[PDB]
Design a protein around this ligand. Structure first.
Ligand SMILES: [Cl-]
Ligand SMILES: [Cl-]
Length: 280
């Protein structure tokens, strides 16, 4: 509900604004937070957050607090806008293209951003967590007007109650439901279903999910994580006992889950060599 009251477009005080994509006569922006000691020539890790809201609504403001945290730790942290149903009459596949365009843009512009182009983390909540996962493991579905010699693939992901299974193929593949998914998603459902793209050799990830989630059942995420681990990938699943969809957000449950998810995300980033340990 609180997340639902966020402003669009957001103020994002202290952020630098860059347009990463011009599409359908809208300028899609990144809201960029740099560390206090940032200099051109830096080669910092970066994180790009994609807001939640069912691919229908939401605001980059959702992840402003996390951006401020990670910029405090020395990352170039940013929150991306992307097209949504209520504002732009797009479908899920369009959202995925925008998320991929954002990672591509950060990589293309890594030098001027003071960023290491092989340390770009994709992150998000719910629908935005789906997008982040798509940037790590789903093939590009379109080639927009952008540098396709530059990869859209993120180097790691941090997912907050993501949607990871968008097709029922290979679960316990009924036709009419997959056809309804096709019309909603703008493509074959498997083409935007991270679970259907599990293979060896993928970037590392951490996932935070409530065990009492009625929106995205925890069991879908357990299945995902088990299969990823079977494929040899680093896929850390942190259950939040009794928590529901949206539990991790700044401003709810006394900020306890907010703080805990940041702590664990920080250690994950140290583990994979994207952040220096807090001990310096
Ligand atoms: Cl790895
Ligand atoms: Cl829920």
């Amino acid at each position: 509900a609180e997340v639902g009251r966020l402003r669009y477009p957001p103020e994002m005080p202290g952020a630098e604004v860059k347009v990463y994509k011009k599409v359908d006569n809208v300028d899609l922006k990144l809201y960029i937070y740099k560390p206090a000691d940032w200099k051109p020539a830096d080669r910092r890790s970066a994180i790009v957050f994609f807001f939640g809201g069912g691919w229908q609504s939401g605001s980059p403001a959702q992840f402003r607090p996390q951006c401020e945290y990670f910029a405090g730790r020395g990352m170039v942290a940013m929150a991306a806008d992307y097209r949504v149903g209520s504002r732009h009459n797009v479908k899920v596949a369009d959202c995925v293209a925008d998320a991929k365009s954002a990672i591509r843009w950060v990589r293309q512009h890594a030098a001027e951003l003071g960023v290491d182009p092989q340390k770009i983390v994709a992150s998000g909540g719910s629908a935005g967590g789906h997008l982040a996962a798509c940037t790590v493991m789903v093939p590009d579905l379109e080639a927009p007007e952008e540098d396709h010699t530059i990869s859209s693939q993120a180097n790691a992901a941090i997912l907050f109650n993501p949607v990871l299974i968008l097709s029922r193929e290979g679960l316990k593949p009924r036709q009419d439901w997959e056809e309804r998914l096709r019309e909603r998603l703008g493509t074959e459902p498997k083409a935007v279903s991270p679970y259907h793209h599990i293979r060896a050799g993928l970037p590392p990830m951490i996932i935070f999910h409530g065990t009492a989630d009625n929106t995205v059942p925890f069991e879908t995420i357990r299945l995902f994580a088990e299969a990823m681990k079977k494929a040899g990938n680093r896929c850390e699943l942190v259950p939040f006992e009794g928590a529901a969809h949206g539990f991790f957000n700044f401003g709810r449950g006394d900020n306890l889950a907010y703080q805990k998810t940041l702590e664990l995300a920080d250690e994950f980033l140290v583990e994979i060599g994207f952040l220096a340990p807090k001990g310096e």
